[PDB]
Every structure is written in C-alpha cells, then in structure tokens.
Amino acid sequence: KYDRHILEDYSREEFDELNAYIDHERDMSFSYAAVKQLEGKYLVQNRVTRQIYETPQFLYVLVAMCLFSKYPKEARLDYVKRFYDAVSTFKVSLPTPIMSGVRTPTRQFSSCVLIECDDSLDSINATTS
Amino acid sequence: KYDRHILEDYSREEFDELNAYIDHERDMSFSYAAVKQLEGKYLVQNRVTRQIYETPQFLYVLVAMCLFSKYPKEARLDYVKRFYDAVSTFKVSLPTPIMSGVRTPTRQFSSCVLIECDDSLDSINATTS
Ligand SMILES: Nc1ncnc2c1ncn2[C@H]1C[C@H](O)[C@@H](COP(=O)(O)OP(=O)(O)OP(=O)(O)O)O1
Ligand SMILES: Nc1ncnc2c1ncn2[C@H]1C[C@H](O)[C@@H](COP(=O)(O)OP(=O)(O)OP(=O)(O)O)O1
Ligand SMILES: [Mg+2]
Ligand SMILES: [Mg+2]
C-alpha cells in the first residue's frame, strides 16, 4: 500500500525520537461530516474489501515525512514538526489528489491538465490516446 | 483527380497506337442497375459537386494501364489488351476498393483488416488510434 522507499530514506534511531510528538488525543476533534468522507474515500484502503489499513492521525505525519525525503539530514527532523503542527491544527488544507495519492506507488499528484487539438487526424488520435 | 505518374511512365508514341483499340461501341451494353450505382459511387467525381470527370469506357483501360507501370517496356503494350478484353467482356469482376480507388493519389487498396487487443491501457489507446 505504501512506497518501498520511506524506510530506506530515514533512520530507525531518530524514528522513535520523532515518534513521541503525535499523541492521538488531538484525533478527537473531528466532525461527522469529516469522518464520513474520510472513511468514504480519503485514505489508503482496498476499494473492493474496504479493509482500512491506516489511521487519520498517522496520515499527516506520514505525508509530511514522505514529502521531505531529498533533504539534508540536519534539519528535516526539526522541520517536519512545523508542517505537522500546521496540518493537524487545520491551519492548512490539502486536496484529495495530494492526500488520496501520497506515499502511494502510483506517483501522480496533478489536479488539472489542458490539451488542444487542431485540424489533423493524427492529432485527434493522439489526443484521444 | 489522377496520380501524377502515369504520363511519366509511358510513351506518347505508343499511346495513340494503343488508343485505336477501345471503340466505345461496347459501352452500349449495360443495365440501368449498373449505370445507377456507377453514377452513384464507382468512378472519380467530386463528392460535393457531382461533376463527373470520367467515362465508364476509359475506366477499364486506365486501371489496366496503371496496374502495369513497373514492367519491361517490351510486352506490356501487348499484355494490357488481354486484361482489357477480360474486364470489358464482363469475364472478370473488380470491387469498389480497387475500382473506387485506382489511379488515385490516396494509394489504399485493401478490403479488410484485423486487430486484437489484450489487457493493457496502452494497447487500447493504440488500437483506438
Ligand atoms: N476520411 C476523412 N474524410 C474527410 N474528412 C476527414 C476524414 N478523416 C478526418 N477528416 C476530417 C478531420 C481532419 O482534420 C480533416 C482533414 O484534414 P487532414 O487530417 O489533414 O487530412 P487531409 O490532409 O487529407 O485533408 P485536408 O487537406 O483538408 O487537411 O477532415
Ligand atoms: N484506471 C483504471 N483502474 C482500474 N482498471 C483500469 C483502469 N484503466 C484501465 N483499466 C482496466 C483495463 C486494463 O487493461 C486493466 C488494468 O491493466 P493494466 O492496463 O496493465 O494496468 P495495471 O498494470 O496497473 O493493472 P494490472 O496489474 O491489473 O494489469 O484494467
Ligand atoms: Mg491536411
Ligand atoms: Mg498490468
């Protein structure tokens, strides 16, 4: 379900050090209109079994850790905390294309694309493909 | 309407020699069910103006001359007469793909094609194109 590079991109020692920053007590601040769509389609789960394999608390820190892979190993640990505190306190909002597709093997994160076709059969076949 | 290679593929001298073999007196042997579809869609004509630019007599000799371009210039003149006598006496029949598309710039003469698509998105896009 995840991408096989996160564990190979960080250290086990600092992992537990950063782990003691995400007490799940803040998870009890949602609304029904939130958890509804969340369980519907926002997090990783098999679309045929619906066996959810994640938790709305590890979501934010997981995406914040994955987005900061290629960085110097001197400030990323103290830098991910700011983004986590921003996303957890609902100060910054993120779409489905970025929360429905993060840390996922299929690396696609755009939201809109444009295309125009002129008078040519080959162009029409190409834009159809 | 024609292809700009026939005149560059034969000689003007033998042209008139082969010309005295196609007295149009045999053109008065059709049926209404023939000329109907012929004027409908069998010979070269603009599909928006319907200004016909051919004649059902020059059709056979034109296609027989065009089909015999790449040949030694020693027997083609005496060889095209056999095919013309075959097609004019209705002994051999020819489809629209070969009579609707001969001596035409768009050189396409097949009649059927096959294609199969397996389980792949790229394959589907390719076969659609
Ligand atoms: N088989 C067809 N017959 C008539 N029009 C077609 C056909 N296929 C596609 N078209 C439409 C869409 C094409 O953009 C347009 C023809 O342009 P094109 O694809 O460049 O072929 P073409 O060069 O033979 O015609 P044109 O000279 O008008 O551009 O007409
Ligand atoms: N976006 C899609 N989601 C689900 N199925 C799709 C999708 N697009 C096409 N399909 C259908 C047609 C494809 O042949 C088939 C998936 O096979 P494929 O094109 O090879 O992609 P894939 O490798 O990611 O899936 P699979 O491993 O099952 O082959 O499912
Ligand atoms: Mg064109
Ligand atoms: Mg596949």
Would you list the DSSP string of B34-94? HHHHHHHHTS-B-TTT--B---TTHHHHHHHHHTT-SS-TTTHHHHHHHHHHHHHTTSS--
Question: Of A127, A53, A59, which Cα lies nearest the Cα of A99?
Answer: A59
Beta-strand runs (E) in chain A: none
Q: Which residues pair with B45 in a beta bridge?
A: B52
Using the 8-state DSSP alphabet, how is residue A45 labeled?
B
Beta carbons within 8 Å of A96's beta carbon, 6+ residues apart: A41, A42
Among B117, B119, B128, the mutation site with the greatest number of ligand 2 atoms within 8 A of its Cβ is B119
Q: How far apart are CA A31 and CA A37, in angstroms?
A: 10
Asked if A128's CB is within 8 angstroms of B126's CB, the reply is: no
Question: Of B54, B52, B53, B62, which Cα lies nearest the Cα of B88?
Answer: B62
Q: How far apart are CA A55 and CA A60, in angstroms?
A: 10
The count of residues in chain A is 129
B66 is in an annotated binding site: no
Q: How far apart are CA A86 and CA A80, in angstroms?
A: 10
Asked whether A123 and B129 are in contact (CB, 8 A), the reply is no
Method: cryo-EM
* Å between B98 CA and nearest CA of chain A: 24
Torsion-angle region of residue B91: left (phi > 0), alpha (psi -120 to 50) or beta?
Answer: alpha
Lookup: tokens for B80: 């095209």
Q: How far apart are CA B84 and CA B72, in angstroms?
A: 19
Ligand 1 within 6 A of A127 CB? no
Question: Of B77, B69, B70, B67, which Cα lies nearest the Cα of B19?
Answer: B77
Beta carbons within 8 Å of B48's beta carbon, 6+ residues apart: none
Asked if A125's CB is within 8 angstroms of B128's CB, the reply is: yes
Closest atom of ligand 1 to B106 CA is 24
Q: How far apart are CA B129 and CA B123, in angstroms?
A: 10
The count of residues in chain B is 129
Closest atom of ligand 2 to B122 CA is 19
Specify the amino acid at residue A10.
Y
The angstrom resolution of this structure is 4.3
Backbone angles phi, psi at A119, to 5 degrees: -75, 90
Q: How far apart are CA B60 and CA B80, in angstroms?
A: 10
